[PDB]
């Protein structure tokens, strides 16, 4: 895999994973329970630069998805199970505006990397006609 | 020493051959996936080797024509 | 080694040098000179060189160089096929038998002249002389030998000419053209003793000795 | 020979590129089937294996060659390359581990390198024909 | 001789490396604290035209092994996540660099084809 | 300087102009004309023109030119190899030794004629004659020298022809064809005297004296 | 059969036939040059 | 004017028509025919055709034409440098010195033939003749001049052959091939006279007087 | 009519058929054959075939065919330019003078042979001959006429050869080669008669009788 | 059938094979060989091969094949055009006439050789021979017939050589070169006997008997 | 029995023609309104037929080149 | 000759002129009292073929407006689209003739 | 010779400069008090064709001493704006489209001339 295709493809993968996390947040906002019974903790991705040994630059890797540890806004329904003493359901802490902006920006970055890939592919296929 | 037409010609043909060999090794390593080598390097060196080949061919044609013209005159 | 480049340049160009350089490198010079000289005796051509004499010399030199070609084949065409010998030791191994063949026929003072005018320094041994000096010396030596053989061939036909002319003029034939009388006598001498086999065998024997 | 020993490497590499090409297009074609488990092959290791061993394609048998009119038919044949699983990101509830972006960037790369191989063979063969005229 | 093609050749090669650098800037246009990098073409090209080490290289079976200045891009509009990739700047630079790569390809094509035309 | 255009353009044209003008500009004219005239004597051709005498003449001219070509090499090919000389000073640096060589053989008066039919003004020294004057003067002088050597070569075989004819007449050979009688004696004379060695040596020693 | 295999085969055979024909041309030319001399 | 199309289209085709029309419209016909006839005298070739006689002739005719080419340069090339002249008046400007030269060389009655057979109208002066009638007239007159020179060339070697044959006949030499003895004397007469300089110079002088 | 389709598709192919068919349809068969035969007489080639005789024949054929070319011009080209004629009427308009010209030169018995072996039915007049019959018949007649001229040209040089040989061996010069003595006399005879004018004028005037 | 699919690919390759196979499979080998041999006699070529003999042979073979071409046209082209025949029965419909023509011309012993070496069994009738056998037999027979004709054409011109040489020797014209004297006599031998018409007519008659 | 490679060329030409004819009749049937046949199937078969036809054209070009070269050896 | 391209060349020139006229129509679609114009393409083409190197007829109006303006925009839009398409057709036809003439030639 | 290509070439080059000038307008479509510039193409092109494209190289001695025109008119505005800016967009828009089209036309003409010479040569 040529280096520049690898860089832009890693960008594409990272953007797809970021958009997926944003969609999962925006979809499970207002979700009382998980499988076992616990709040849905809002999810974020971690972007880090790739190619750690060598040139210190190139590509983006989204290893280690993490959780946004904000204090998980509460509501009061003291007849609902999943409510502790001081009946307080846990109610995922997803901020819809932030997630919508994340989706928009991720789509735009995805487009930019796709279209870098197209430009580079044309560049290389033209290089193959060097001379002849 | 002396101009050594045989030795000089041998050295020139060796230069042609090793330029071709260097280009071929580079292309081999590029298509095998070995990192490093860039695509433009491959194409440029391949074309350079081709131009060296063509120059050698033209020199050969001119020398062969010269030899066959000299070795045909009636004495 | 060479790389699908120069190989099939040096080969096709070597085939181009074949007819002149390689044929006059080995034989077919002595044989062709001797055949032409024999044609000068016995009168007219009567042997179509573009058709017969050149081909006869070609066959004779094939026979003559059967040993050197066999040794070349043994030293190169076995090893050089697919393994362990690649166009550098092949070249010197295949040069050795031809070079010994040429050195074995070269007059020992032709090489002297061609070294003394190529400004070559000392030549250590017989193997130290290069092809540069070996080619013209071999050609000059072979010309000398061809003229010697032609002279010996001219001896008996000259004898027949003079004896026939003497007989004609002594018996009173004042002014007959003895050449036309002698020509069939030339044929008779040349065929009764089975002359062609003697000539080709003597050439073949003397060519390497 | 010695014509098909110098051109052998690029020929084998280009055929292997075509084989990886239909592997990747099988990935693309099964984009939305459930439980597909996208496949791929390692090109460098497989190319070294091809050069050292040969073709040795595994699995394939045609009918016999008797007098004409005996309806030739063939079994299902597959190259000896060992298909490797592509390590998935983003589980998707239906087993399908075909990520459009990964498969598609690999498709474009493989296409470009196949074209490069075609260019290299064309150059070598034009060189041969330029020697011989 | 025939290193008269060197300049453009190396120039072209340098442009390609630049692309990677610029491409990385676009890839990491969202990561926090990337500090967009770039190189200056003219000085880098001059230095390379003016100009890793060899290992144990006796006969084979000893495993030979092979061993630019990435300058900050001074930013504008600070963004609180350390990312200094002003994507607009990088888009303009990428377009221009792709164009100059095409120009170099055309120049090598012309020099090589002139060479080939003289040779037939 | 030139830019790998006209370089490798003038190179190929120089190669094309090589076989005719360069060979008939350096040597191999005297040698080949003297070989042709020796072939006129001794009877028939009896030595193949298109291969062997041409090859031997090429080898003789290479050996004679080796000092000239070595000077040209040390004055161009090293200093033209990438440094301070690129096919503009290469041309004149290489021409000067060849020009001196050709001047050393030109007849003193051929130069005069060709200068006087160029309307060239007065010339100061041998360095003032241009190649335009120097080619045809050298060619004409070479033809004269070749014909002089031709005399020296015809003399002894003319002696043999006449002495054989006189013996044959005095003896009373009415009309024996003395040419066939004298041909083997011509070959004999040319082989005992060791004529090929000493002839090529004489040409060489003549050619730079 | 693979398509790239078919074209590589095409070109290999074409080059081989060209080389054989050129070699025969050189040999025939040498034969005629030998047979056109004077004896 | 013309526009770097048809200009540079007439140029390349003019260079195509060069080798025949231009080398056989100026000189090099008389000179080469005299050289060939001279070579028929003195026996065998004794000068390689395609190389030494042809090259020497090319040099010589360049030397005769240098004044006409000088005038053609002054009247075409210098003004054709961008200014007041481009291949329309330039044509006859460059023709006029050449036409003057050819008229000054043509027979005064070959023009009559090639005019009367063209149905051409009555001519006022030398300037009114067209290139059309001028070419074949010049060629035919030049062939006449070449054959006159050739006859004069054959004179003295004819003298030598006759005197040699007569001496042999008086001495009683019934059947000696007088050509063999006479050939070295032919070269004799051709070198003591210093024949190459005289002949080259006399051709040049005859060609303009 | 044709529409810059087939037009300029038949023009370019007309030009490719030009050099052989059209130049061997009109003249330049007779002229070239006569010049070649003349050149066998007068000794060696001694005239640059592909240079002077071909060009002289081209000019001669231009002049001979000029009335035909003018009639074709006036009857075909200008009427073909823009008005009432387009490449079918043009064909007979341009052929009629050419067909008449070839009829006037054909043997009155070649047409018979080719018409009878082409199964052609009775021919009403000279205008009923098809081009298919008239081409090869004209070629055969032209070959006959050229060989007739050839013998008639050979005659006087045969006279010179035979008289020189008779005088030589009558005087006792038994075996001096008469060709070598005769060649200057052949050139002398052909120059005193002003042979080139007589020849080319007679060829031209024969070619319309 | 094919649908402007592979058609017009097979057609264009058929046009490619036209010049060689279809002019070396029908006629034009015998005629062209006879013309070449005729030029071998009559001394020098002096007939422009690339144009006149080739053109005359091509016209003569067209006139000979007008019946065969007519039958192939009538039974292939008219039906192959749009209806009931298209490149499937077109081949055999067009081959039967050509086969009949080729069989009528074959020497009866060549078919024997090529059937005995192709390992084919006994052949019942004239038709049983296939193309794979018919072609080499036809070309061998055509060569045989062409050389029989050509050597019978030589015989009279060598008679002329005999008589002229013997007369010159009888008169004692010692070494007058009888070829030069014979050449004009060969020419009138070939024109008084009405040579070209008789030759073309005999070839056309022989080519269907 | 025998291969008779002219028969092999005939077989190749028949294959090419039959494939093109099949694609043409499928387009025939589809545009005629015949139910069944799909548009993507039509286009795919037309694509394959086009590739086979260019196969035949390239083989033609190289066979003609080969024949024009074997007719150049001097004999 | 080489007047075999004359018909399409003059047709394409007249098409360009009609484009200019219709653009002027669109531009003056608001100026009071404009009295929209046009040319008859067929008649003008025949007139330029018979003689060589154009009266501005008045487009007959519908739907009065009290500003005198008679550019009825819908008709002008359709005619402008038609003229542009016919111009592109003329380009393709001339291109095909020139392609053919230069294909036959080399 | 080979100055036939000069005219078109100059035109092409001048077109490029105008693009820059025009581009400046677009880039300064809102900077206050800009006072849009433009150049008169015909007069500047004729001036270049008459004379050409002033500078002097460094000392003409040996190396190691390291030796080494279009008047911008003002666009008459319409629609004043109380920031001085007289770049009226619409005019710049149409000028940019026209300049781009005529630059392409110059490229096509120059390419046709170069192709003509190359076709004649080969």
From Swiss-Prot, chain A:
Family to which the UniProt record says this protein belongs: Belongs to the flagella basal body rod proteins family.
Stated name of the protein: Flagellar basal-body rod protein FlgC
GO biological process, one term: bacterial-type flagellum-dependent swarming motility
Record keywords: Bacterial flagellum
UniProt-annotated location(s): Bacterial flagellum basal body
GO CC terms in record: bacterial-type flagellum; bacterial-type flagellum basal body, rod
Hydrolase among keywords: no
A Pfam family: Flg_bbr_C
Subunit and partners: The basal body constitutes a major portion of the flagellar organelle and consists of four rings (L,P,S, and M) mounted on a central rod. The rod consists of about 26 subunits of FlgG in the distal portion, and FlgB, FlgC and FlgF are thought to build up the proximal portion of the rod with about 6 subunits each.
Presence of the UniProt keyword Isomerase in the record: no
From Swiss-Prot, chains B, K:
Keywords: Bacterial flagellum
Membrane-spanning segments: none
Record GO terms (molecular function): cytoskeletal motor activity; structural molecule activity
One GO location term (cellular component): bacterial-type flagellum basal body
Gene Ontology terms describing biological process: bacterial-type flagellum assembly; bacterial-type flagellum-dependent cell motility
Subcellular localization(s) per the UniProt record: Bacterial flagellum basal body
Top-level taxonomic group: Bacteria
Cystines in this chain: none
Main location: other
Family named by the database record: Belongs to the FliE family.
Name of the featured protein: Flagellar hook-basal body complex protein FliE
Species annotation: Salmonella typhimurium (strain LT2 / SGSC1412 / ATCC 700720)
First-to-last residue of the parent protein present: 30 to 104 of 104
From Swiss-Prot, chain D:
Keywords: Bacterial flagellum
Localization in the cell: Bacterial flagellum basal body
Gene Ontology terms: cellular component: bacterial-type flagellum basal body, rod
Disruption phenotype: Defects in flagellar assembly process.
Extent of the signal sequence: none
PROSITE patterns per UniProt: FLAGELLA_BB_ROD (PS00588)
A biological-process GO annotation: bacterial-type flagellum-dependent cell motility
Stated family: Belongs to the flagella basal body rod proteins family.
Record note on quaternary structure: The basal body constitutes a major portion of the flagellar organelle and consists of a number of rings mounted on a central rod. In Gram-negative bacteria, at least four rings, L, P, S and M are present, whereas Gram-positive bacteria lack the L and P rings. The rod consists of about 26 subunits of FlgG in the distal portion, and FlgB, FlgC and FlgF build up the proximal portion of the rod with about 6 subunits each.
Protein's job: Structural component of flagellum, the bacterial motility apparatus. Part of the rod structure of flagellar basal body.
NCBIfam families: FlgB (TIGR01396)
Name of this protein: Flagellar basal body rod protein FlgB
Organism: Salmonella typhimurium (strain LT2 / SGSC1412 / ATCC 700720)
């Amino acid at each position: 895999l040529l280096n520049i295709f690898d860089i832009a493809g890693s960008a594409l993968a990272a953007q797809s994973k970021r958009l997926n996390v944003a969609a999962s947040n925006l979809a499970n906002a207002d979700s009382v329970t998980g499988p076992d019974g616990q709040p849905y903790r809002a999810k974020q991705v971690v972007f880090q630069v790739d190619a750690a040994p060598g040139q210190a630059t190139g590509g983006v890797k989204v290893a280690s998805v993490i959780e946004s540890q904000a204090p998980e806004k509460l509501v009061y329904e003291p007849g609902n199970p999943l409510a502790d003493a001081n009946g307080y359901v846990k109610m995922p802490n997803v901020d819809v505006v932030g997630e919508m902006v994340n989706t928009m920006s991720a789509s735009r970055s995805y487009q930019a990397n796709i279209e870098v890939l197209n430009t580079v592919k044309s560049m290389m296929l033209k290089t193959l006609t060097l001379g002849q | 020493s002396t101009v050594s037409f045989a030795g000089q010609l041998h050295a020139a043909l060796d230069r042609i051959s090793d330029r071709q060999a260097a280009a071929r090794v580079q292309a081999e390593k590029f298509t095998l996936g070995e990192p490093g080598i860039a695509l433009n390097d491959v194409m440029a060196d391949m074309q350079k080797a081709s131009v060296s080949m063509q120059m050698g061919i033209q020199v050969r044609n001119k020398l062969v024509a010269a030899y066959q013209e000299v070795m045909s005159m009636q004495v | 080694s060479w790389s699908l480049s120069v190989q099939t340049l040096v080969f096709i160009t070597s085939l181009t040098f074949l007819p002149a350089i390689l044929l006059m490198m080995t034989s077919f010079t002595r044989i062709i000179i001797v055949f032409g000289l024999l044609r000068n005796a016995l009168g007219t051509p009567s042997a179509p060189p573009n058709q017969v004499l050149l081909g006869l010399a070609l066959f004779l030199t094939f026979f003559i160089m059967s040993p050197v070609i066999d040794k070349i084949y043994v030293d190169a065409y076995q090893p050089f096929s697919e393994q362990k010998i690649s166009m550098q030791e092949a070249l010197d191994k295949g040069a050795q038998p031809l070079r010994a063949f040429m050195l074995r026929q070269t007059r020992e003072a032709d090489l002297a002249l061609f070294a003394r005018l190529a400004n070559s320094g000392p030549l250590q041994g017989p193997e130290a002389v290069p092809m540069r000096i070996l080619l013209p010396a071999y050609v000059t030596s072979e010309l000398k030998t061809a003229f010697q053989i032609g002279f010996t061939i001219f001896i008996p036909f000259l004898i027949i000419d003079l004896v026939i002319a003497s007989v004609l003029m002594a018996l009173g034939m004042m002014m007959v053209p003895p050449a036309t009388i002698a020509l069939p006598f030339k044929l008779m001498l040349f065929v009764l003793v089975d002359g062609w086999q003697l000539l080709m065998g003597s050439l073949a024997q003397s060519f390497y000795s | 020979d010695r014509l098909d020993a110098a051109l052998r490497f690029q020929q084998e590499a280009l055929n292997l590129r075509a084989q990886r090409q239909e592997i990747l297009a099988a990935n693309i074609a099964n984009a939305d089937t459930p439980g597909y488990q996208a496949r791929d092959i390692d090109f460098a290791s497989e190319l070294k294996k091809v050069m050292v061993r040969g073709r040795e394609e595994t699995g394939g048998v045609a009918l016999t060659l008797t007098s004409s009119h005996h309806i030739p038919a063939q079994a299902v044949s597959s190259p000896a390359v060992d298909l490797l699983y592509r390590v998935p990101d983003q589980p998707s509830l239906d087993g399908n581990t075909v990520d459009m972006d990964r498969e598609r960037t690999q498709f474009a790369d493989n296409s470009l390198k196949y074209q490069m191989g075609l260019t290299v063979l064309g150059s070598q063969l034009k060189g041969m024909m330029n020697v011989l005229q």
